[PDB]
Symmetry: D2
Subunit: 344 residues, 4 copies
């Protein structure tokens, strides 16, 4: 056998350092111990390991937070479609129990939470044809379906509130911004199944710079014809979110998906020289030079994440991962949260 | 041989209809005929075919447009990172020659165009480490590098303009919105290498609902301390873009990337019951239920694209595809555009 | 407000049919009921729903199978890297308990199972640099590390077996094929942590057409110098796998990843006019025209999946999903499997 | 304005080194200079830059090669679907002009080249439904269509050759392997539109370890019933490809797609301690720990690519990129290749 070929393939190696963790997956011969099965992800490799790490990093934020400012200001960001999904329940739970501090989502993430209190979203298929669906008035979101009548009901619900908002603006001197509007819609919906009803109740601000990009915008638009004048200033909202990071004793970022939501939270944290913790769960890739697909390490170069931080990105659809992440972090600490509220 | 196995594999088929196009790639034995090579993409299959179709659909918008309203209002949308890239040149060219009608980009897409007139962006590597880059003040965007001193120069340039903007607001009664601001920055830069200098010159509105999500926002934020009061209303901008679609004789959508940009243009077109043409070039996928990754057919179900339209999505990085698309469409019709301006 | 704009956005819709399932996510207010949490995935949307469906379809195969042929011949296919990961444990479990009938993996999927009995694989990072790793003799697989000394130990272990294999070929008249070789390596390893030790014990054939593409191949190659003559015929293996599908009373396909593995199983099932069940968990996409990324519906057009079947593809990294899928299917039916073996 | 916020955002940076290349895209004001437009990709950023680099690295292999061994042994690997596409023409061109040295493709990549000489492949749509297509006997490959009658014609063509192959094996003592078989099919087809007709003519070996995974396999399978005995040994083929790398004065790897093809070529090059050049064009991603999606740097850690080499991966669909890459490399050097053949 050729010497050079042998030497290249049979290259010797020393042993790995003692601290080295072995790849080992869950052993079903033990039966189904879910907690152990979930912890086993950490040593399974690839994204499972990243999920194992995410759990560890979210638990660090929490522990830190449990040490009105708190010991750690957690920013929760999520894309609109995630509110279209069942993750709406997951998010509402965190908000309901005051487990997070700031929320940021896109227009869809706001409106669809309120509309779900008016009518449901249904399961459909990615393959459903647009033409046939349009002829029936059915809007498709992935493999989900939103009957257009939901938006017609949304209008009936929203319009009178918009009458009042423009009224307050012009007589009571109210300066509306996306966050202020969202807090108002949340109080109006007055439904415990709503994320914004709880955010409003627990004084958790919700930022959404492009609140006009969706149904709410459609309604504001049509309403402006009979009632012009409504102003939504995004500048004051910039101030609000930014000072939230600046005056934080410590920060953690939990971001599902990318886009404006991901960037907005990271930019707020740049104001304090970087977030202390960061866990992302998104499907975007770096190859196209996009922000959405950028690895956390890129954020480090900008100063958005502390150089000493240990950000974690799980490359996966958050509809499958977020509830598992919550099961092993926030849901395990319920009693701990209640404790700080003097309820346990 | 088993009868059932044979029947299943050797299933007979009739011939395909006459109109059937054969898969055939460019034959280099002809030498390098670029135009023929590019047209050959249409019969190459996969995304090449989609590129072939995109060329056909963009040429349809144009031809239609060449029949102040025009015969076809073209909406050009692109993500921020694409302005970070060399596609800035491509986009400026279209805008400079009044080849498109409405532009929509995110905060980064605005600011980075102006900053590139102050200092350049450099080539780097995706692999460059955040820590080391941060210690040197270098911001990483994909495999591109933006020295932080660019932003320090941006501040020096921008601040005095912001002084004037708040001044005009409070004495001249100016109501600022993202589009109005962008048009002003474009006039101020006063540089032919700028996309917004030309947009401003050719009266092409630029919408960006979340203009606060970036450096401009950073600057507005800091500036608000010495000079509070600046208001950026996104509502009037909703009206402007929406009526652009509503009063269009016909519309075409050319969108690079996804996010707010993609959704905002499609929602404006919903106002007229759908765009007549739509060509997208983005890397997003549908599996996660995201808007960005949604196939054009999903837009059809919403009414954003006409049922009779023939939208085309090229799954590719637009930095590699957009200049080819422009070479075969807009760039081939230069004389035709000049003609309508009475210059040829 | 413009009539046409209103009509387009406020389009009425009838209600969805009664059979319509509402999107609803798990409610953590119930505490952490893992089983309920996992079932809730079905109504969460996007890939979670696809996971919910996958569970249903894998449970259908099983139930059917529990009605030497069995009532349903299950083909389990997986890529090499999945054996590098902790999914090696998951796969061994299924094989150990005779829960599946045919296995198909690539060269890496075979060799790395045996080597893990000689030395472990470690956790590393995707970011680890090739140069530095090579200078230390460490091979990188994703965020996993395989010290090259593992392969040096592999050689010491394998060589004497190869001496015997060529010997048997030439004196005992043995006709070697990948499956026969794999069964032999499995008996030789004689370790209960091995997938192939169990496959061999439970008479579960393992197909791997390109068994030469890896370390085993490296070793066969070097060994052929001192001992030429070894022949690995892939034709007889084609016959074996094909008749497995042809003479099956019913078939189900569980495929993790794509490539040869995915195609080989689907082609075997074409021999019986299609698989009755098919569940895939892979990250590939259709846009590039690849087999790996092809949706199950494409397989239907070929006759690889029955038109009446209900294939399910979960777009996700199987290291995170496969153990959950096993927890809710095979692991829930342990007693049922033991029953058919007259052990419960 | 908060001092800490200012300092974090307005962090100063020194200038980048002189050797720093500025991001600048093609300027269409110059008109359409295709060559310049293509070179401009190098400074456009993201994958365009990677394409610019790919061109540079493929031109380096060539130049080196132009200095029966040659000064650089180029391995060309491509997935099956790429032969289904128009890239079949591109590949045949390189092979026809003896521009590459070794080819490696999967079963589909072999058979579909031959079948295209019997009947064409057509353009279809990714959206075409499997059921309806199956009822008509039409096989779908991405947005391409292969009427099943093509395979029925394939059988008529192939069978008599298989009769002869088994005959030669048993009387003439021929030891068949995938490469030997492919060379024979190539001579039999006797058509200049065929990749394998030319490979056979120019003595360019074609490796395909899993040649049984497709139609050829289907035919071998059925044929084995009337004529059993055919043996396809993959071991000798391992030797052939491996020594090709071992005895090369220098090597370059051009790989389209991933899977067995990509790994097989890289493993052959490990035998000489690594390839000197490597250019990949594939859509796979690293997150799932797959080989296909592994960055070239991972190959460096294994010793498959020389530490001093400069591998390049273009993240894109090769149907759109490969013809451009060929236009700027091989096609520009036609006269140079003819020269070494004493024809110019
Ligand atoms: N339901 C909807 O999708 C909906 C409804 C109304 C309006 N809109 C508008 O669309 C625009 C764009 O939407 P967006 O900014 O929320 O993001 P998006 O939906 O466009 O997604 C941005 C990125 O987030 C990631 N992502 C999405 N879903 C994910 C998931 N399930 N798991 C992991 N990663 C995921 C993807 O990588 C994607 O590239 C917004 O302005 C929004 O208001 C969307
Ligand atoms: N240069 C930057 O990336 C930059 C700079 C400053 C601020 N920001 C902010 O980041 C936020 C998100 O950025 P965004 O909304 O512009 O989008 P994004 O960069 O987050 O990308 C959204 C989607 O567009 C697609 N995409 C991106 N590049 C593409 C390309 N090269 N070719 C084809 N498809 C492509 C991807 O699929 C991605 O999922 C914005 O609010 C923005 O202002 C970004
Ligand atoms: N550990 C290794 O990666 C390894 C080791 C030795 C040899 N090899 C060789 O590499 C060649 C290619 O490997 P392969 O055919 O096994 O496939 P691959 O690893 O190249 O992957 C093929 C496709 O499977 C999918 N996939 C991979 N991991 C997945 C996961 N974690 N979850 C969901 N989907 C996933 C991806 O979509 C990918 O496009 C083979 O011939 C093999 O023997 C690989
Ligand atoms: N036409 C076909 O697809 C076809 C036909 C018959 C048999 N098969 C069989 O399918 C099995 C798998 O096919 P394969 O190994 O050739 O690979 P594949 O088609 O499964 O693809 C493997 C990886 O290559 C990449 N890839 C594919 N097309 C690409 C492109 N257009 N541009 C850039 N990257 C691309 C993808 O990332 C994919 O993950 C093989 O054994 C093969 O014989 C395929």
């Amino acid at each position: 056998a050729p010497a050079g070929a042998l030497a290249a393939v049979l290259k010797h190696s020393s042993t790995l350092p003692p601290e080295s963790t072995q790849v080992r997956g869950y052993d079903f011969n033990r039966g189904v111990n879910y907690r152990a099965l979930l912890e086993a992800f950490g040593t399974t490799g690839f994204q499972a390991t990243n999920f194992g790490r995410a759990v560890q990093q979210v638990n660090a934020m929490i522990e830190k937070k449990l040490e009105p400012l708190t010991s750690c200001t957690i920013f929760l960001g999520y894309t609109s479609n995630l509110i279209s999904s069942g993750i709406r329940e997951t998010i509402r739970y965190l908000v309901q129990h005051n487990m997070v501090d700031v929320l940021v989502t896109t227009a869809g993430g706001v409106e669809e939470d309120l509309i779900k209190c008016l009518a449901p979203t249904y399961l459909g298929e990615f393959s459903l044809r647009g033409k046939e669906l349009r002829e029936n008035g059915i809007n498709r979101i992935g493999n989900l379906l939103v009957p257009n009548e939901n938006y017609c009901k949304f209008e009936d619900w929203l319009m009178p509130i918009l009458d009042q908002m423009v009224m307050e603006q012009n007589t009571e001197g109210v300066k509306w911004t996306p966050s202020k509007m969202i807090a108002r819609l949340g109080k109006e919906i007055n439904n415990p199944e709503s994320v914004y009803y709880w955010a409003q109740k627990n004084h958790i601000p919700v930022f959404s710079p492009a609140l006009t990009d969706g149904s709410l915008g459609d309604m504001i638009f049509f309403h402006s014809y009979k009632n012009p004048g409504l102003v939504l200033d995004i500048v004051e909202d910039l101030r609000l979110i930014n000072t939230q990071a600046i005056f934080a004793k410590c920060t953690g970022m939990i971001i599902l998906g990318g886009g404006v939501v991901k960037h907005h939270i990271a930019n707020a944290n740049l104001m304090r020289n970087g977030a202390d913790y960061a866990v992302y769960i998104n499907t975007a890739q770096e190859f196209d030079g996009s922000d959405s697909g950028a690895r956390p390490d890129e954020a480090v170069s900008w100063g958005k994440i502390r150089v000493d931080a240990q950000p974690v990105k799980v490359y996966a659809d958050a509809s499958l991962v977020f509830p598992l992440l919550v099961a092993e972090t926030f849901a395990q600490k319920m009693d701990a949260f209640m404790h700080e509220k003097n309820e346990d």
